[PDB]
Design a protein around this ligand. Structure first.
Ligand code: HEC
Ligand code: HEC
Ligand SMILES: O=C1O[C@H]([C@@H](O)CO)C(O)=C1O
Ligand SMILES: O=C1O[C@H]([C@@H](O)CO)C(O)=C1O
Lengths: 126, 126
């Protein structure tokens, strides 16, 4: 869907920006600094679910640019491992949210965050 | 969810960027220049549905900035009219996509695009 590689870069960066907001805005809730409204979090995690599937299609071959390492391309099976583990942790977060279980939400939130960071540490330029 | 007004600006601009890609990537299909796969379009319109709800919460009071006119704030009931008409046209696009009806998809796509443009013409800086 991208006329030039730059358009893929702008897409994936925008998708990432939205995931960071929908993930990070839950920080006060999982820390207990903001109230836990199970319906609010269920709805927010549904948005994050949708967003979480979007970046990966915007790293097609030859879309080197942005802060994307060429190893995304030179080490591709491993990159797919990191995005599928991340998406699998998003499924677990959805399950915790859908269950209305705050302790499980805390734990699942942390697993997601660790997956974000593991991919960045390997595949995102400093 | 925004620590400073700039963060709301960056969010709404990123949401807009993603809607432009998910809307605009259908142009070749509605023109007949790319094949029409009803399931592909249904899935894409579901993504656009989700995205289409996101910008509006990132124009809270005092989030003047970006290319957002202060009339979004000084003429607020009218801005809400333009975002609800747009969201209502997204419902019609969803219905056309879910029905697998290409002629209806063409027509609904055009109505959505006109709603985007009408809001920009009134409320987006040049
Ligand atoms: C690999 C499988 C990743 C996972 C999982 C997550 N992110 Fe990511 N992110 C990744 C790359 C390769 C890049 C660079 C993209 C580019 O071309 O520049 C990014 C970038 C971001 C950014 C910065 C966006 C920008 O505005 O430039 C953010 C804020 C970000 N990523 C957040 C984020 C979050 C919150 C994630 C988990 C919920 C997450 N990423 C996962 C690769 C990967
Ligand atoms: C008002 C009810 C709008 C409707 C409907 C749509 N858009 Fe919009 N858009 C609107 C404003 C006020 C702004 C400026 C935001 C800011 O603070 O700068 C925008 C911006 C955009 C952009 C540019 C994003 C950027 O990267 O800076 C794009 C690409 C865009 N809008 C696209 C878009 C599409 C495709 C829409 C219909 C599907 C649409 N917008 C509707 C206000 C409104
Ligand atoms: O909110 C975010 O969470 C991850 C990471 O910081 C988690 O460790 C990331 O990259 C964000 O923008
Ligand atoms: O794809 C887009 O459609 C609208 C508008 O051009 C429709 O007339 C817009 O602002 C886009 O980025």
């Amino acid at each position: 869907q991208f006329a030039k590689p730059e358009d893929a870069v702008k897409y994936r960066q925008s998708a990432a920006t939205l995931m960071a907001s929908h993930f990070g805005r839950m920080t006060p809730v999982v820390k207990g600094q903001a109230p836990y409204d199970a319906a609010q979090i269920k709805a927010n995690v549904e948005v994050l679910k949708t967003l979480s599937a979007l970046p990966w299609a915007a790293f097609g071959p030859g879309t080197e640019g942005g802060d994307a390492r060429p190893e995304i391309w030179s080490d591709a099976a491993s990159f797919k491992q990191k995005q599928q583990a991340f998406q699998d942790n998003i499924v677990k977060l959805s399950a915790a949210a859908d269950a209305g279980d705050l302790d499980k939400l805390r734990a699942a939130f942390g697993d997601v965050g660790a997956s974000c960071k593991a991919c960045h540490d390997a595949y995102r330029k400093k």
